[PDB]
Amino acid sequence: AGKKVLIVYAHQEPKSFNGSLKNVAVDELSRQGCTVTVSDLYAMNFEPRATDKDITGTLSNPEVFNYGVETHEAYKQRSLASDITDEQKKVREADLVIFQFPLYWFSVPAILKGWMDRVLCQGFAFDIPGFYDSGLLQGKLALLSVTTGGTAEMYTKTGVNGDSRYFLWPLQHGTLHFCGFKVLAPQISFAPEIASEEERKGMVAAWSQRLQTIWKEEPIPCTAHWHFGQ
Amino acid sequence: AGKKVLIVYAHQEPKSFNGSLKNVAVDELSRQGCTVTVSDLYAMNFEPRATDKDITGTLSNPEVFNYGVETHEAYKQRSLASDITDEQKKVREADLVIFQFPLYWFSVPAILKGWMDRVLCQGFAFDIPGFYDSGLLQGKLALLSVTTGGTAEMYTKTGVNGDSRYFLWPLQHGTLHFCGFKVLAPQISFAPEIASEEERKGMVAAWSQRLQTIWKEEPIPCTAHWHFGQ
Ligand SMILES: Cc1cc2nc3c(=O)[nH]c(=O)nc-3n(C[C@H](O)[C@H](O)[C@H](O)COP(=O)(O)OP(=O)(O)OC[C@H]3O[C@@H](n4cnc5c(N)ncnc54)[C@H](O)[C@@H]3O)c2cc1C
Ligand SMILES: Cc1cc2nc3c(=O)[nH]c(=O)nc-3n(C[C@H](O)[C@H](O)[C@H](O)COP(=O)(O)OP(=O)(O)OC[C@H]3O[C@@H](n4cnc5c(N)ncnc54)[C@H](O)[C@@H]3O)c2cc1C
Ligand SMILES: COc1cccc2c1C(=O)c1c(O)c3c(c(O)c1C2=O)C[C@@](O)(C(=O)CO)C[C@@H]3O[C@H]1C[C@H](N)[C@H](O)[C@H](C)O1
Ligand SMILES: COc1cccc2c1C(=O)c1c(O)c3c(c(O)c1C2=O)C[C@@](O)(C(=O)CO)C[C@@H]3O[C@H]1C[C@H](N)[C@H](O)[C@H](C)O1
Ligand SMILES: [Zn+2]
Ligand SMILES: [Zn+2]
């Protein structure tokens, strides 16, 4: 069990709850002897915008810019911007990719959305054909570790926000599964801002605890039924 | 009449199918006598990252940075960065906000995600109280005009991508409904890229044609049931 983990981390403040979850991941995975890398997006001033700056070569059509076409061709030619290919190396080497982030509008913060848009390009993360179970990152695991303002009860079928799993669909299925990841069950730390000090440490320790045995876990069945029920 | 429309547009290429949909909207709504404003995020090099540059002057806590709180206060205290307040003014004035974008990872392109993250701050778009039915943008309509790479066949309950309504939930319900918008039926232009000019013109025309009677429309019931039910 010599494993490589990439944590893609998206919080502005090292002393945040997200920051603590990120750090206990690094501590506990390091302790196990795993190889660990963190992409700290805000600290890298990570570029989120999909633009023609992401290709440095001769464009396939320089008069009508098609991001998807130009990045696919640029990946094959190796003329992608280097901040993109630096992240791809990290992914390629990883056995597990953990995403650590606060929920922003039922989704990831824009800086991490940009990571997904720019890094997971055609040719690297998927092809046509070559997606979902035939996606190019098959054999890798991914895991969303999410924090929320709202409560667990708010994130139920009958609660105001609907079930937590509803908002996971575009990320777990439309992105990770599409790229061929197997998806481990999400870690959702609900409403730490509201929680007591003891409840906070508890949530942190539950994460650290889960990580002790993460390599023994099976992935979820990443299906409409899992996310939405019958 | 005197209706005000903001189009928030997220495409790199003026000649794109998205560009054409935005321009038809400008043309037809202008023709009707509406007041029309376009936020061209890519042309504006719109900042998507939520950072402490979003607050001008001195922060409520320069030691430990909490984006939500710092921007809550800054809105209340009129100290938000001008790119944000410029956008908020456009929204405040609008009766209808149309979002025009290609689908990126079952969601909006990161640059548009950044607009939602940074522009729809606490105190402007929502508060305790005032969310969902009572959110601070009540009285306004919102409409998502999405283009996809995938076919309508794939975006069904049993198709590989699941029902298009599944990916609408975080946008329509978690974001737009949450802020008080009444949400018009989405405009989904499926797989323009592989369609014939005959079918493309048809999609553009349905859009122009739909815009003729947009102000007569009923909002969808923006419910978990509308999105996931039978
Ligand atoms: C733009 C935006 C959009 C948002 N959209 C949504 C949304 O759609 N849905 C939703 O539910 N929420 C939403 N939120 C709220 C957001 O998800 C939460 O504020 C976020 O998840 C909280 O995590 P945090 O790291 O920022 O918390 P923090 O405020 O950093 O943490 C809470 C407390 O934990 C303490 N702490 C830190 N380390 C430890 C430690 N190791 N042990 C114990 N305590 C510790 C911190 O000091 C802090 O007091 C949004 C917020 C923003 C800004
Ligand atoms: C990072 C990334 C992530 C993506 N994720 C997804 C995803 O999760 N799911 C998914 O389904 N797809 C996804 N896509 C694909 C994407 O949604 C489609 O490529 C996009 O919607 C195509 O729209 P467009 O405006 O760019 O098309 P274009 O290529 O610009 O347009 C299609 C054709 O219509 C022509 N046209 C333009 N104007 C007119 C007109 N007025 N009348 C007639 N014809 C006209 C254009 O010239 C062009 O030839 C992703 C793409 C990228 C780059
Ligand atoms: C755009 O963000 C959202 C979008 C959709 C839903 C939501 C949110 C959201 O931000 C959010 C919250 O921030 C919070 C909650 C929440 O449900 C949501 C959403 O559902 C739960 C909460 O309000 C309580 O439990 C109150 O007792 C605490 C928390 O607020 C935090 C953040 C601020 N510091 C706030 O002033 C208060 C002190 O606690
Ligand atoms: C990260 O993007 C995605 C994420 C999840 C699902 C999807 C996509 C996606 O991009 C996507 C597509 O781009 C395309 C399709 C699609 O289903 C998806 C997703 O489901 C359908 C398509 O392949 C055909 O209908 C061909 O007959 C055309 C189209 O391909 C685009 C790009 C190809 N390189 C080629 O240029 C083709 C003409 O258009
Ligand atoms: Zn899946
Ligand atoms: Zn709703």
Structural domain boundaries in chain A: 1-230
**Residue B129 DSSP symbol:** S
Q: What is the largest CA-CA distance in chain B?
A: 59
Q: Nearest CA to B85 among B121, B44, B134?
A: B121
* Cα–chain center distance at B208: 18
Resolution in angstroms comes to 2.0
Probe residue for ligand 2, chosen from B17, B99, B194 as the CB with the greatest number of ligand atoms within 8 Å: B17
Instruction: Tell me, using a 6 A CB cutoff, whether residue A153 lines ligand 3.
Output: no
CA distance linking residue A208 with residue A9, whole number of Å: 16
Residue keyed to tokens 């009766």 = B95
Question: Under a CB-based contact definition with an 8 Å cutoff, are residues A60 and A73 in contact?
Answer: yes
Breaks in chain A after residues (C–N exceeding 2.5 Å): none
User: What spatial distance separates the first Cα and last Cα of chain B, rounded to whole Å?
Assistant: 38
Q: Nearest CA to B48 among A117, A213, A157, A27?
A: A117
CATH 3.90.1640.10 fits B1-230, yes or no: no
Please state, in angstroms and as integers, the Cα–Cα distance from residue A166 to each residue in A31, A156, A196, B169, B171, following that order.
34, 9, 27, 8, 12
- From the CA atom positions of chain A, what is the Rg in Å? 18
Breaks in chain B after residues (C–N exceeding 2.5 Å): none
By what method was this entry solved?
A: X-ray
Please state, in angstroms and as integers, the Cα–Cα distance from residue B65 to each residue in A158, A191, B50, B85, following that order.
34, 17, 11, 21
Three-state SS for A194?
coil
**The token pair that represents B210 in the structure block:** 């739909």
Tell me, in angstroms, the distance from the centre of ligand 3 to residue B88's CA.
21
Tell me, in angstroms, the distance from the centre of ligand 4 to residue B149's CA.
4
Q: Give the side-chain half-sphere CA count within 13 A for B167.
A: 26
Instruction: Tell me, using a 6 A CB cutoff, whether residue A128 lines ligand 4.
Output: yes
Going through A41-164 in order, the beta strands assigned E by DSSP cover 96-102, 141-148
Instruction: Tell me, using a 6 A CB cutoff, whether residue A190 lines ligand 4.
Output: no
**The token pair that represents A68 in the structure block:** 């998807």
Q: Give the side-chain half-sphere CA count within 13 A for B22.
A: 24
Judge: A227–B166 Cβ closer than 8 Å, yes or no.
Answer: yes
Question: Under a CB-based contact definition with an 8 Å cutoff, are residues B80 and B54 in contact?
Answer: yes
Question: Under a CB-based contact definition with an 8 Å cutoff, are residues B130 and B177 in contact?
Answer: no
Question: Under a CB-based contact definition with an 8 Å cutoff, are residues B172 and B182 in contact?
Answer: no
CA distance linking residue A165 with residue A223, whole number of Å: 11
Please state, in angstroms and as integers, the Cα–Cα distance from residue A133 to each residue in A126, A219, B116, B132, B177, following that order.
10, 13, 32, 37, 34
